[PDB]
């Protein structure tokens, strides 16, 4: 008793709409940040995460390398964890 074709294609339409909605996630924001350094996406995300700020400051400076300590590294790792979990709400 498989769903009809119309049911499946209605689900497909729903999927396309919902993915268009999903285009606004923080992960997406990072992905489509065309700047050589992720300056714009990190400026947006600095209002949501400390690690975004810690990454942001040196990347604006166009530093070839970034020195992180224990606290900054923990914050950056938590930032990436949030990016994965999609807990950052980009407004």
């Amino acid at each position: 008793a498989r769903p009809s074709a119309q049911t499946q294609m209605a689900a497909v339409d729903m999927l396309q709409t919902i993915n268009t909605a999903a285009s606004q996630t923080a992960a997406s924001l990072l992905i489509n940040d065309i700047t050589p350094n992720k300056t714009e996406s990190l400026k947006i995300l600095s209002t949501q995460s400390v690690g975004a700020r810690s990454l942001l400051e040196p990347m604006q400076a166009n530093a070839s390398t970034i020195k992180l300590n224990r606290i900054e590294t923990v914050n950056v790792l938590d930032f990436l964890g949030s990016v994965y979990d999609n807990t950052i709400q980009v407004i």
Partner: protein
């Protein structure tokens, strides 16, 4: 150092179960008090961010696809 280790473990479970990304041994030095700071290459950190971001977006879109398929199934 315990907090850093456990947070690495958390992001590991989320992003890289076998810990094959180059970033992991580069961050390991921070577990030693003497290594107060580590100089990392900006490109490496950006690439790690992009790995996390692309994997995350793919997971989000795939979860949406699963929800759509289950909706088509009806019995959800």
């Amino acid at each position: 150092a315990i907090a850093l280790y456990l947070e690495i473990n958390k992001l590991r479970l989320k992003i890289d179960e076998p810990m094959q990304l180059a970033i992991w041994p580069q961050l390991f030095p921070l577990l030693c008090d003497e290594h107060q700071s580590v100089q990392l290459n900006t490109d490496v950190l950006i690439n790690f961010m992009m790995h996390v971001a692309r994997k995350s977006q793919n997971t989000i879109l795939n979860n949406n696809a699963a929800i759509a398929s289950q909706y088509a199934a009806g019995n959800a």
